[PDB]
Amino acid sequence: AETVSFNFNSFSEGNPAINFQGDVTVLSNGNIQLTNLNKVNSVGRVLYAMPVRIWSSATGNVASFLTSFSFEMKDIKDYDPADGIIFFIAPEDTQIPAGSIGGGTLGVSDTKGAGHFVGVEFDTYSNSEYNDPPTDHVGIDVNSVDSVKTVPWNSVSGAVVKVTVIYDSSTKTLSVAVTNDNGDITTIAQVVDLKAKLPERVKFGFSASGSLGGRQIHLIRSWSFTSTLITT
Amino acid sequence: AETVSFNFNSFSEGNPAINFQGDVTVLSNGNIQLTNLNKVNSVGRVLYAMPVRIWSSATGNVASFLTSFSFEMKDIKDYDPADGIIFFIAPEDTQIPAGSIGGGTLGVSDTKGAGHFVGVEFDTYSNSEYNDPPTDHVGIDVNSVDSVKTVPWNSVSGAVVKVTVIYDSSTKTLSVAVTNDNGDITTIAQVVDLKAKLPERVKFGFSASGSLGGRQIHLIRSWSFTSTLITT
Amino acid sequence: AETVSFNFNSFSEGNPAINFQGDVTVLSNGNIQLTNLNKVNSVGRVLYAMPVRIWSSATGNVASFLTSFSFEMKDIKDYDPADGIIFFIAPEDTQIPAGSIGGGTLGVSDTKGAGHFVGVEFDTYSNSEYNDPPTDHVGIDVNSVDSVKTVPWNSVSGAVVKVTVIYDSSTKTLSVAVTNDNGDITTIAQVVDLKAKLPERVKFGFSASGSLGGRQIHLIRSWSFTSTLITT
Amino acid sequence: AETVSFNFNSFSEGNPAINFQGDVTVLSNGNIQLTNLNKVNSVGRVLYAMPVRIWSSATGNVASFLTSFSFEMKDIKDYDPADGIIFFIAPEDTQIPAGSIGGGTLGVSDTKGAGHFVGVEFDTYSNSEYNDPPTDHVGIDVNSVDSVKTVPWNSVSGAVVKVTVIYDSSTKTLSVAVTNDNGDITTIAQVVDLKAKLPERVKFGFSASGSLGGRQIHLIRSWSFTSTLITT
Ligand SMILES: [Ca+2]
Ligand SMILES: [Ca+2]
Ligand SMILES: [Ca+2]
Ligand SMILES: [Ca+2]
Ligand SMILES: [Mn+2]
Ligand SMILES: [Mn+2]
Ligand SMILES: [Mn+2]
Ligand SMILES: [Mn+2]
């Protein structure tokens, strides 16, 4: 039983348990603001500093993990509410794509929307070049922002959104449950073999981005995580 | 968007929001004691009073729900810890089987261990006649306590256990993440078409049962639930 | 090396190992409820029946001890939490102060908040008459609930708290580590010359109290204890 | 409220949370054997891979931590049982001192027995050059294997030893509670300003050394830890 577990009710600069990339910033109240409102094509990513072993090439086993986080997106006069936030898993050498154009790539893909990652996005701007549905949505991404699956969702400015994710290694199922301000929940699940798409050791994080005309406040308020690899 | 959501940090006799059945009692702190230790073959169930609609015959849609609860199981001199607790879903008229023999039936099945229900069991006693794994386990039960699927588990006497469940209607997947006292998680997932195994309107709840030589303390400490059915 | 060591994972009236004083009552799950919610200025105390020799006048040696225990405090409409629990050490003949007014005396002191004891209080209601801090707090008490030193704490209703106390006779240091539900730890330590404040033989126990308007549920879930006295 | 917490009931090579230094080896049963029996001056160290911030220069606050771990030492024919284990805290860049001669340096000090670290040793070999007591002992080391304080102890071969450490930030007290196989406890405590002796970011870990004629099996059976730094 190999278990990595952490809980964040707030954040602060200096904590060695978390890595910042790009235009990330910690607010006095302890929240993480992922993008910068004055930069064009902004990109902000926050990662748990320590890599986590999600599978052993020895036991062949794959870990299960339970994580939940709360975020908030808020409009600002008078740019378009873009582009959203993404909870991702990637190789430990994961950096903000070079020459990132931000926007629809969400800071995890190249200009074509390709990359090495597995994630859950909370997309609030429609990008046709990536085949986005016409409305706000939640999608499961596997090496591309061209979601492997999506579900209609509604991003309510200033609302605090609570998310719960469960990965069952046995069925290799990734289930997501989103709790909107109104109390309604949105779910989405997709079978993804983490052992076949990611390396033994990976990192977990949040990413968000904007464009020239599209910018909003992307806030990460809290994050608790727990993985458990069976060794034997 | 039809949603049902409730949250109990503690219970109490009376509250018409929860129908009791059997040897159920309420401790001083609001904890529910599903069974009685001075009674042979005891059964006790607790149900959310108001029935819930998990699917529509018109729309065809099945509801998605997110539920979490924390229970505790403690041993008693010198008796055997059995059998345990089951989170279940059944027809709005559900009742403790006629002539319930308690024990392995968990208060939801008959002698053969069959019944009209869906649920997750935290089985602590192994009944070979029900093809029970040799050790403590967690199982996805569909109309039978002879689990559709099980996973090795460890029940620790006196430890507060936390459970989170997510049912994604899009995939008909039922995900379970069990957080143990020591922080390790156990998961199990199973595709279960509720729409096919249950009526449009059901009731959610907990059930536990002891036998003659097998009795233990089963307590429910909290329960929050949210189901959402799309009506469009 | 004289060693006294015991473990209590569940309690049960009748056990000659425990002395019950006041309004104490054992729940059916094995928990000890210290206060009566239907009584004004209630007081309850549970004590290890066998007096423990912490020091000897013959050698001048003082014993070191290690002890851990878990409690649970929960609210009750619309009353105010009062007043909390206190782990205390005292003369083997200790009884509840005659004419106990309940309140912030925790059942170990008189109206002026004075008594003959040493303990760790987990104060939830602030009493200006006892120089209490404005918020919930943990404190080291020496013959008075007018703590020799307190520390900011946060009592969370329905939450299981873990405490570990270490007394080093060589330094006469009493150390307390409090594990909250969220995983945060709270500590407080202080030099207390036991040999100079209590008789050679004393009793160890917990006590809780409520008042007229302030009442809550105080539960002791477990308790393990080990002291070693050097004889040479 | 910043908090780091991990828990190991067993260990396995490959876990990125653990850093191995020296002759460290993981046994088939999940234990960590710190030294190499066929090697002269064998030195083995295991550290928690993630640096911990024990104090911020911003607020000037020191963290509090509660740790506990079980270890075991076993004699090997007919070599002398040496030298023991040390639980230490050093700079995040800490490495086995070049030209480490092992033995009484315990793998954290130079020839003179000096280095940059704070720790608790379980010394089973008297080294007059470092002023060790004539017998097995436990000591609080502050930048030197010439303990600032010791207490008589007794290493029993094959015996599992359970230790619990508490470091209260308010008093800057480091308290240790050692529970021997037979059930007797040994405590030692010392005031130590971790903010005056170490940098803001450090690493925790265990070290073990041997000599030419002094060798034995040093095992770390399990380790749990929780630090909490109040950033407010
Ligand atoms: Ca997009
Ligand atoms: Ca069974
Ligand atoms: Ca008070
Ligand atoms: Ca030595
Ligand atoms: Mn998209
Ligand atoms: Mn079963
Ligand atoms: Mn007080
Ligand atoms: Mn020494």
What is the DSSP secondary structure assignment for residue A126, as one 8-state letter?
-
**In this structure, what token pair is assigned to residue D30?**
């999940």
Q: Exposed, middle or buried by CB within 10 Å (0-12, 13-18, 19+), for B231? A: exposed
Q: Exposed, middle or buried by CB within 10 Å (0-12, 13-18, 19+), for A122? A: buried
Residues in Cβ contact with D220 at an 8 Å cutoff, skipping those fewer than 6 apart: D11, D31, D32, D34, D46, D69, D70, D71, D85, D206
Task: Report whether A187 contacts A176 (CB < 8 A).
Answer: yes
Of D1, D50, D231, the CB nearest to A17: D50
Cα of C36 to ligand 3 centre, how many Å?
18
Positive or negative: CA dihedral D47, D53, D57, D61: negative
CB within 5 A of ion ligand 4: which residues? D 104, 123, 125, 127, 132
What does the angle CA D218 – CA D222 – CA D225 come to, to the nearest 5 degrees?
120
Most A CBs within 10 A among D19, D28, D227, D231, hence the mutation to make, goes to D231
Q: Give me the numbers of helices (H) and strands (E) for chain C, helices first please.
A: 0, 16
Q: How far apart are CA B133 and CA B112, in angstroms?
A: 17
CA closest to A152 among chain B residues: B230
The residue type at A230? I
Residues in Cβ contact with B164 at an 8 Å cutoff, skipping those fewer than 6 apart: A66, A164, A166, B66, B67, B68, B176, B177, B179
Q: How far apart are CA D200 and CA D63, in angstroms?
A: 10
Instruction: Return the half-sphere exposure (C-beta side, CA atoms, 13 A cut-off) of residue A43.
Output: 19
Task: Report whether B25 contacts B45 (CB < 8 A).
Answer: no
What is the DSSP secondary structure assignment for residue D104, as one 8-state letter?
G
Binding residues of D for Ca(2+): 123, 125, 127, 132
Q: How far apart are CA B141 and CA B138, in angstroms?
A: 10
CA closest to B37 among chain C residues: C28
Q: How far apart are CA B22 and CA B15, in angstroms?
A: 17
- Judged by DSSP in three states, A116 sits in strand
Name B69's bridge partners: B163, B223
Nearest residue to A227 (alpha-carbon basis) of A68, A78, A67:
A67
Return the domain boundaries, chain A: 1-232
The method recorded for this entry reads X-ray
Task: Report whether B70 contacts C181 (CB < 8 A).
Answer: no
Q: How far apart are CA C113 and CA C100, in angstroms?
A: 10
Of C28, C157, C160, the CB nearest to B160: C160
Q: What is the resolution of this structure in A?
A: 2.7
Rounded (10°) CA dihedral D14, D15, D20, D26? -70
Instruction: Name the CA radius of gyration of chain B, rounded.
Output: 16
- Judged by DSSP in three states, A60 sits in coil
Q: Exposed, middle or buried by CB within 10 Å (0-12, 13-18, 19+), for A2? A: buried
Nearest residue to C79 (alpha-carbon basis) of C127, C24, C39:
C39
Nearest residue to A169 (alpha-carbon basis) of A125, A231, A214:
A231
- Within 8 A of A9 by CB-CB distance, chain C residues are 182
CATH topology for B1-232? Jelly Rolls (2.60.120)
Q: Is C130 annotated as a binding residue?
A: no
Of A1, A15, A17, the CB nearest to D10: A1
Positive or negative: CA dihedral C185, C191, C193, C198: negative
First-to-final CA distance of chain D: 7
The residue type at D36? N
Phi and psi angles of residue B103, each rounded to the nearest 5 degrees, phi first: 70, -130
What does the angle CA B86 – CA B88 – CA B93 come to, to the nearest 5 degrees?
125
Task: Report whether A87 contacts A45 (CB < 8 A).
Answer: no
**In this structure, what token pair is assigned to residue D71?**
């270890």
First-to-final CA distance of chain B: 8
Q: How far apart are CA C136 and CA C146, in angstroms?
A: 14
Q: Is C132 annotated as a binding residue?
A: yes
Q: How far apart are CA C66 and CA B228, in angstroms?
A: 51
Q: CB–CB of B217 and C72 under 8 A?
A: no
